[PDB]
Amino acid sequence: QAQITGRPEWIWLALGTALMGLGTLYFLVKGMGVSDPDAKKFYAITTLVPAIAFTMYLSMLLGYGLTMVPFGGEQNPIYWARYADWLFTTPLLLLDLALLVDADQGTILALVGADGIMIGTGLVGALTKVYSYRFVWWAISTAAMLYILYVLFFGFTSKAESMRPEVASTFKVLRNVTVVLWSAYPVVWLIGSEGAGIVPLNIETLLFMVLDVSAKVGFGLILLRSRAIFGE
Numbered sequence: 657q658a659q660i661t662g663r664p665e666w667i668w669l670a671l672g673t674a675l676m677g678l679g680t681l682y683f684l685v686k687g688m689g690v691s692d693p694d695a696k697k698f699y700a701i702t703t704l705v706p707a708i709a710f711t712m713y714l715s716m717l718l719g720y721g722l723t724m725v726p727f728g729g730e731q732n733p734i735y736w737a738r739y740a741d742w743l744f745t746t747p748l749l750l751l752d753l754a755l756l757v758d759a760d761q762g763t764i765l766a767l768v769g770a771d772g773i774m775i776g777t778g779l780v781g782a783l784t785k786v787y788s789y790r791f792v793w794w795a796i797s798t799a800a801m802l803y804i805l806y807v808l809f810f811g812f813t814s815k816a817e818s819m820r821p822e823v824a825s826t827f828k829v830l831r832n833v834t835v836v837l838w839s840a841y842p843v844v845w846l847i848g849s850e851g852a853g854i855v856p857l858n859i860e861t862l863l864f865m866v867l868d869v870s871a872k873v874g875f876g877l878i879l880l881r882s883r884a885i886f887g888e
């Protein structure tokens with residue numbers, strides 16, 4: 657019965673793998689030249705996030721990143737490999753924006769640590785047997801998310817507006833893309849296999865695939881095609 661997996665969403669997973677991989681190879685066979693030590697950081701950071709995502713999407717495709725969790729009434733398919741990805745992916749995405757706005761080490765740590773809680777709490781939620789409690793973890797995860805998005809929006813903007821026109825402009829486009837994409841994750845989770853079965857794992861997988869590739873490669877293509885602070 658149970659929210660069928662290991663087979664339907666294979667195309668989505670495979671397609672995720674393809675885009676992440678090509679996006680990786682792209683950022684690689686583009687960062688060939690790049691002298692500027694500042695620009696060097698952005699290329700490095702932004703190339704690892706596709707590579708992490710490639711590794712993890714492969715595991716889901718090949719089955720390894722799938723597991724079964726007892727909840728609600730049945731044997732529920734869960735892709736923990738998402739949290740393995742996101743654990744390192746989402747802090748690096750933050751580090752790009754931190755570096756771009758030259759944020760204080762204080763905020764950076766507060767940020768990365770908070771992101772740590774967001775994903776960790778998410779995984780605890782995803783694997784929690786007791787149905788009712790999954791939403792306790794979702795709420796906490798969403799609090800960690802909205803905190804991060806707050807400092808990005810109401811914080812990092814002001815600091816950005818004081819940099820260079822290019823930096824303020826570039827940060828803002830990214831800030832927009834980030835706030836929007838990130839805010840989708842708790843929604844698609846809550847309606848998906850992982851929470852209330854409004855929407856099947858099949859669509860849950862597809863939504864996350866589109867969101868993920870946008871938040872890795874789409875995000876990266878805004879950044880690595882602009883003036884990356886002093887550098888290019």
Ligand SMILES: *C/C=C(C)/C=C/C=C(C)/C=C/C1=C(C)CCCC1(C)C
Binds near residue numbers: 742745746774845867
């Ligand atoms: C490339 C992947 C990205 C940018 C992933 C972002 C992930 C989040 C913003 C996750 C948020 C979550 C919630 C707020 C609730 C349920 C648990 C999470 C981790 C899925």
